[PDB]
Every structure is written in structure tokens, then in C-alpha cells.
Design a protein around this ligand. Sequence first.
Ligand SMILES: Cc1cc2nc3c(=O)[nH]c(=O)nc-3n(C[C@H](O)[C@H](O)[C@H](O)COP(=O)(O)O)c2cc1C
Ligand code: SF4
Lengths: 245, 71
Amino acid sequence: KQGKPRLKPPFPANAGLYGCPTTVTNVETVAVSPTILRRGPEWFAGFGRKNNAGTKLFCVSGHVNKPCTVEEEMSIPLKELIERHCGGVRGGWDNLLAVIPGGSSVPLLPKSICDDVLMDYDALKAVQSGLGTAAVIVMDKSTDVVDAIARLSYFYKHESCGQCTPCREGTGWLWTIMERMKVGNAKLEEIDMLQELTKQIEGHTICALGDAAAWPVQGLIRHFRPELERRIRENAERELLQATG
Amino acid sequence: TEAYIRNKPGMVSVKDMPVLQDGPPPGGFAPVRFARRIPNKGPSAVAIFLAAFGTFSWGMYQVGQGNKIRR
Ligand SMILES: Cc1cc2nc3c(=O)[nH]c(=O)nc-3n(C[C@H](O)[C@H](O)[C@H](O)COP(=O)(O)O)c2cc1C
Ligand code: SF4
């Protein structure tokens, strides 16, 4: 049938693929299973940290000199990873503006935070974000962060299939608001409305794509309010100056 | 559903948005009067009484002179 999700109370352990007991696992875990089961679980637990352990392969791409994908152990400082395996950012902690640790479904990490955050399931999970798929993205000081977030929200609009209403409607709306905020055609109460919409969608959808559509804009208006307010103020001033003629 | 309807032109926030122009001008227009005031400036007692009595006496004198002429 069409690619639409189900309701969870029949968890896919007693009513799954054909109604049979069927579980879904990512290719990561099921592909790592043989060697972890052969080389003993202690050799595995001897990595990462106490509650987060194992070797995960990150795919670092975006605004680095050498876009790469390499496997490291969890709880690795972002500085260490980027500066060691991948190429150093065009300016090492100089023109690096934003970092998205997880996939596109994870709130941002500004420059001041990510200098000394560990890379595991808990450290940045405690900061605000989530490791998710561990696809770290970096964005220099010469890239409109609000434009990147708007493009991500457009993607989420173009992917939410639309079974239940919150995700569908709210995602179209979020893309529209993010475009208007990219150009600068809004007010401040509009960014508070953005936060409110984010909260509603995140709360009340079927499964995690609602949270996916809500998280990036939430992190944006959490860690990047001043520049957004500056864009709004400059557009308002330019509009007034033009209207005076 | 209120921002541009109320006022679109140039505000930066929802406050200081509209222009209303509803009530009174600055000053309350006036202090007004509400208490009655009826001035009593007519000739009060002795003026009117002397007028009546004097005109009566003089009219009687005139009637006398006239009846003299008519006789
Ligand atoms: C919006 C959305 C996107 C997802 N994308 C992926 C994906 O790219 N790969 C994947 O294996 N699972 C994806 N999932 C499913 C979850 O990651 C699911 O927990 C996972 O397949 C099973 O977890 P595990 O195998 O790590 O235990 C997605 C789920 C949602 C709601
Ligand atoms: S965004 Fe949510 S409610 Fe919509 S199709 Fe995806 S899981 Fe379903």
C-alpha cells in the first residue's frame, strides 16, 4: 500500500509486517551485529562512555575543507573529530557559525556550545540536541543560517505524506513562515508564534516526523534570536525609508 | 488576522500599531454649567407700591381737572 505509518499501541512485535510478529532494525545495528557478537561484548563496551558505548561512523559534510565519512568511538569532542579525521573547517573555530550534530532533524548547536561538547547519545542530548543519525553539518559565517533552516523546512514540507493533520498543515505553515522570515517580512510576535506552532506540532502528531519538522526551527529561534531580530528590524527600517518616498 | 488590517504600514511590533481617533480632544471641552441661576432684578417692593399709589393719586387729580372742563 502507500507509504503511511501506523498507530503504535499495536507495537511491531505482535502485529507487524503481515500481522505477524515483525521487528524493524536499522542497517547500522543489524550490520554491526556479527562482529560485536563474535569479538565479545566487552571489547565493544570498552568504547564511548559509561551508558553510551560502541563505534559509530559519522558522515561529516557541509562547509569543511575535506568532506568525509569515517568511523570513530562515541563521546569524541567535535573539535577532535573535525580537526583530526575530516579536514579542519576553513577557519578552525574562527568563521564556523553553526553546527547540526544529528541529521536534519536535530536542533542547532551554535559556536560557543560546540567547542567542548562530547559526541554521544547523552552529552549533546543533555545540551539540547540529539545524536540521531550522526550526520554532523557545519556552516560558516558566510551562509545565511535562516536560509538553510528554511530550505530544511521546505524539505520537511515536501516529505510529510500527510496522514494526520498536525504535521501536514503545520509543516506547510512552517515553510511559509520561514521564507517570510528569511527575507525579513515579519515581526517579533511572529517568531513567538513560530515557537508556539513548533510546540503544538511536536506534541501532537502520529510519530516522529512531526518532531522532525518542529525541532530545527525550535533550535534556530532558541540559539539565534538576535540575528533574526536584526533582519526584521532592518527590513522594517528599509520599508519605512522606501515608503517615505 | 489583525496585524495588517488594523495597520499594515511600518510598525516593527504589534504594539504601537493602530491609530484610533475615537473620543474627546485634550481638555474636556470646557467646564460646563449645571446649577440654576435666575437673577431677581425687578423693582422689589417700595418702588412698585409707590408707583401704583402715586399714579393713582395723580390720575384722580387728572380726572378732576377733566370733569371740571366737561362741566
Ligand atoms: C521521520 C522519520 C525518518 C526516519 N528515517 C529513518 C532512516 O533514514 N533510517 C532508518 O533506519 N530508520 C529511520 N526511521 C525509523 C527510526 O529511526 C526507527 O527507530 C529505526 O528504524 C529503528 O531503530 P533502531 O534500528 O536503531 O533500533 C525514521 C523514522 C521517522 C519518524
Ligand atoms: S509527518 Fe507524522 S502524521 Fe504525517 S505521515 Fe509522517 S508520521 Fe504520519
